[PDB]
Ligand binder design. Structure first.
Ligand SMILES: Cc1ncsc1CCO
Ligand SMILES: Cc1ncsc1CCO
Ligand SMILES: Cc1ncsc1CCO
Ligand SMILES: [Mg+2]
Ligand SMILES: [Mg+2]
Ligand SMILES: [Mg+2]
Lengths: 249, 252, 248
């Protein structure tokens, strides 16, 4: 825990353009680790907000025509402002609508992290999550995080596999959508983030999940979600170091 | 608990076009019973989503001009794909805006379940809940579920009255809006669902509400809502069978 | 606890045009105190709804071009109907977009309460929270509530400072955005509310927060949120009277 300490003290302004199902949970997750979430969606204020922000999350979970042109416009505003973009191509494999939009976005702007599941990342570039992540990294030259049973991170010349979390995370809507926001909270305006910042963001989230699911008062997916926020708020270096399970490839 | 066991194993894709106050809760409810919710609202992807989905929920709780034309278009796309629609005419009796919209929708598309309170269903058709449900069934030839102190379901040649749930359920926003999603999770792509699927859906919800409200850790409407999700996640056959209360059944 | 008793019995219909991060939490907080929330955003039903409503909340937390004209239109419809408006100029200091919009809104319609933090209310008008609140009152001739470490209320010829609540509230998104909706719930269709109603609304919220944070089962910001809703639901006169901390 190096980056988390800085999030708690500096309260980084983390702009979220995310889906309607997960806005509240995203904002709450960010507040629990000390970040300052802002769900600004008006392109008319992007320039002034982005000047002082630390990152931008773009998540297309509920993409519609109302969002398309605005997302492209704000991504260009972010690039111009040097504001790092975390991009979550939610369910891109499920429609030609989403595929065509994600291709247009990644042809129009440079993003700093692409986060998804194996199937989503595979649809972007078209078996192993590591192989998929490496192929995507070669195409976009942008950090890749593939979430799954084990999580994969590829940045620069390094690929890492992480093994933390809980099954109850799959049964909470926008767990993974919140993870995209947490990653944005760890960037501190670095458009080419150190792999160590990405490893800490994913590990903080998954170790908090693991600890929450062990709490005596966790009785299922409903009670888990408040206990995850509490555990993120309290997470300390001892717990982190005892629990982290990482290995290189 | 025949259908709930199948939801947990098959993980049915359940598309929800629902109101902004209850999206998250609705998705979490569906996940807790094993379904796979998707809040897709773009008509441009409805054809590809609906081919593989098991039902669609349409709920007009926060209806605005931005939604009107899109709802009509996706209902038609559902009808063309054979995808069952669960329609929740939220607060239809409260404005001419909502009345006119709901009338237009039901003239444009065939829905598979209409779910509402007695006042909502009465406003649609222009009396006890059973009489209102039967009149609505005669007009739309579509399953009707009327929620209330007792719940009423009319489908095919039967009318049933059910008696489960909790007072805390009225103090949680989108409890009922979640019920419309749960129902959609029980349809398995049947455009004329068996009444037994509707009975199980309403009973699973109300029994889970009852048991959550009895939990020692339930301290009010705030702690109830996480407990309801847990109870839906854990609900078993023994608890279902011990608790279910059918009040009366009429045939034909 | 005069007004809260009446909310529980009368179940006032409280229209909320609020931001997409806090809609569910706002509706739940209102339901917990006995109010009847309705998140109606269609100008086409504003006239019928507002006739029977007790107040309207306007909160610009996620303001976009899709909202601008509609907000102006429904604020005018509220004025015509005699429906009191609570206005929360969320982050107004953060962009010229929001500054321009809030200026236009307050030139187009008369609101009944303006609620914000000190930096928001200062950006609206252009040292301490009391001074800012008095200057805003002199400009808009409208009750002002400034939230902070201590809360400030200015209405008519009185200014009050309150000292209740919990740090945990700042770590729960739309706590403050809920307070706007709770204030609306205490208006009972009074376009010039008594300062006592505003003091009660803010005190109920803050005392509930303080009691929730002391619960043995409150383990942080995540468990706090459900416990705040429970504590609003159960809050009684005895606890209110024991806990209230008011001055000037
Ligand atoms: C976090 C956030 N972003 C826009 S609105 C909102 C809730 C607090 O005002
Ligand atoms: C359930 C759902 N539907 C669109 S976005 C979302 C949350 C998980 O991505
Ligand atoms: C409180 C509320 N307002 C609009 S929709 C909704 C939930 C179901 O009416
Ligand atoms: Mg994803
Ligand atoms: Mg209904
Ligand atoms: Mg404010």
């Amino acid at each position: 825990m190096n980056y988390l300490n800085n999030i708690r003290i500096e309260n980084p302004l983390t702009i979220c353009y995310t889906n309607d199902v997960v806005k509240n949970f995203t904002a709450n997750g960010l507040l629990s680790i000390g970040a300052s979430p802002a769900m600004s969606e008006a392109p008319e204020e992007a320039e002034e907000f982005y000047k002082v922000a630390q990152a931008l999350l773009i998540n297309i979970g509920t993409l519609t025509a109302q969002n398309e042109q605005d997302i492209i416009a704000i991504a260009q505003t972010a690039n111009e402002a040097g504001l790092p973009i975390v991009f979550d191509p939610v369910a891109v494999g499920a429609s030609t609508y989403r595929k065509q939009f994600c291709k247009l976005l990644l042809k129009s702007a440079k993003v700093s992290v692409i986060k998804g599941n194996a199937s989503e990342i595979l649809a972007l570039i078209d078996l192993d999550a590591v192989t998929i992540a490496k192929k995507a990294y070669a195409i976009y030259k942008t950090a890749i995080v593939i979430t799954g049973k084990e999580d994969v991170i590829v940045q620069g010349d390094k690929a890492i596999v992480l093994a933390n979390g809980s099954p109850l995370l799959a049964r909470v809507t926008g767990a993974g959508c919140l993870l995209g926001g947490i990653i944005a909270g760890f960037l501190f305006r670095e458009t080419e983030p150190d792999i160590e910042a990405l490893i800490e963001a994913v590990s903080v989230f998954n170790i908090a999940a693991e600890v929450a699911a062990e709490n005596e008062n966790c009785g299922g997916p409903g009670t888990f979600s408040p206990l995850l926020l509490d555990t993120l708020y309290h997470l300390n270096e001892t717990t982190y170091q005892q629990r982290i399970r990482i290995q290189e490839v």
